[PDB]
Each structure stands twice: as structure tokens, then as C-alpha cells.
Design a protein around this ligand. Structure first.
Ligand SMILES: [Zn+2]
Ligand SMILES: [Zn+2]
Ligand SMILES: [Zn+2]
Length: 131
DNA sequence: CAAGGCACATGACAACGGTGTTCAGTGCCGCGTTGCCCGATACCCCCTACCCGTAGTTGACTGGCATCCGGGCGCCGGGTCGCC
């Protein structure tokens, strides 16, 4: 996980933690679990590094209904969209050219030069209903 | 003269006002800690220059050295050969 800044142990640690975790996580709870591992990193430095990763793009970032920015890495680097369970957090990556073609058709119809598409579908998970 | 009808105001009724808290997150901006990058520095190599130890050198050449006295002074102590 190369970073723009000079490599070191702490960014390697947070990158490894993101690698192991395959769920949407917020910065403060990420720091909580990171401290639980025992690295004892600083909150603002964690903020700096995760902002850098979000800028780099290898970690997808979503915004919750409360307004929180939640980050997680995707195995595949191609652009896609994530289906997430609010109760459990199971993030599954799917992509379809139909939505993209729809976006380009709308942009051309309205004469838009460039566009940015953001699509997240929220829904109720299958296993949580069962007890 | 008493009973029945209309005005204004009134006991509650929430919802705005405005401002104060609270979450909580994410930075903002001053204190300290970190990967680089090089640069010099100790430490392997090769070469030869020079220090230092060993071993020969065949006419003959076969016993030295200069001592030491003007203490001085007395005693101890033992040795040492005469003594009868
Ligand atoms: Zn993604
Ligand atoms: Zn898309
Ligand atoms: Zn679920």
C-alpha cells in the first residue's frame, strides 16, 4: 500500500488493518480498534493518512445518513458500486454498464460537459430478518 | 321582571425564536517525532620495501689484565700455626 508520504510503520499498520477489515468503518471506531490492537496511534495522524488514501482512491468512501464518512478497501480497482447492510455491514461490489450509459445519455441530452456519478443502494439484509 | 341570545377574553392548547449546549467529527495550527537520501569511515583485499635473524667465510695466527700501598680505627671473631 504505497502512500505519497514517506513510508513508515504506522501507515503500514493502518493499511494492514484496512486490508484485514472488509466492512465500512468510521475514523473514530477505526482508531478504537487500532488502539485495541495496541499500536496507540494519534487520532489526527490517522485522519491525515486516511484522507490521503481517500484521495489516492484505492479505498472507497461513503457518507452515512448521520453524515459520517466511512472507508473501506475494494479488492478490485475498477469503478463499481457497493451494496451494504446497515445492521451487519456486508459490502458487496457490483457494477453495470447500463447505469453508466444512462448517465452519459442524460449528460449528452442536457449538454453537460463532465459529470460525476454516485449511486448507493440501501436495503434490508436477508439473514437479519431471521432469528 | 326573568330567561335566552350575542361580544372579547380566557384557561388550556403547540409550535415557533433564538440561543445554548453536545456529539462528534474533523481538522487547524503549533509542539514534537519519523521514513528516506547520501557521505564518510572502518575494514577486507592485493602489491612490494625493508627489518631482522641465520649461516658461511680456510696460508698461518695457542695465556691477559692492571692492579695495590699516605683511610683510620677499632673491634670482633675466627683461623693458624708455634709451643712445650
Ligand atoms: Zn470501491
Ligand atoms: Zn457507476
Ligand atoms: Zn445484515
Amino acid at each position: 500500500p504505497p502512500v505519497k508520504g514517506r513510508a513508515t510503520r504506522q501507515r503500514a499498520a493502518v493499511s494492514a488493518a484496512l486490508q484485514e477489515v472488509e466492512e465500512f468503518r468510521s475514523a473514530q471506531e477505526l482508531h478504537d480498534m487500532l488502539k485495541h490492537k495496541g499500536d496507540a496511534v494519534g487520532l489526527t495522524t490517522v485522519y491525515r493518512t486516511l484522507q490521503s488514501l481517500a484521495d489516492a482512491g484505492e479505498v472507497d468512501v461513503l457518507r452515512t445518513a448521520e453524515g459520517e464518512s466511512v472507508y473501506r478497501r475494494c479488492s478490485t480497482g475498477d469503478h463499481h458500486h457497493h451494496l451494504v447492510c446497515r445492521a451487519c455491514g456486508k459490502a458487496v461490489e457490483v457494477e453495470g454498464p447500463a447505469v453508466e450509459k444512462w448517465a452519459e445519455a442524460i449528460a449528452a441530452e442536457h449538454g453537460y460537459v463532465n459529470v460525476a456519478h454516485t449511486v448507493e443502494i440501501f436495503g434490508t439484509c436477508a439473514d437479519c430478518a431471521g432469528a
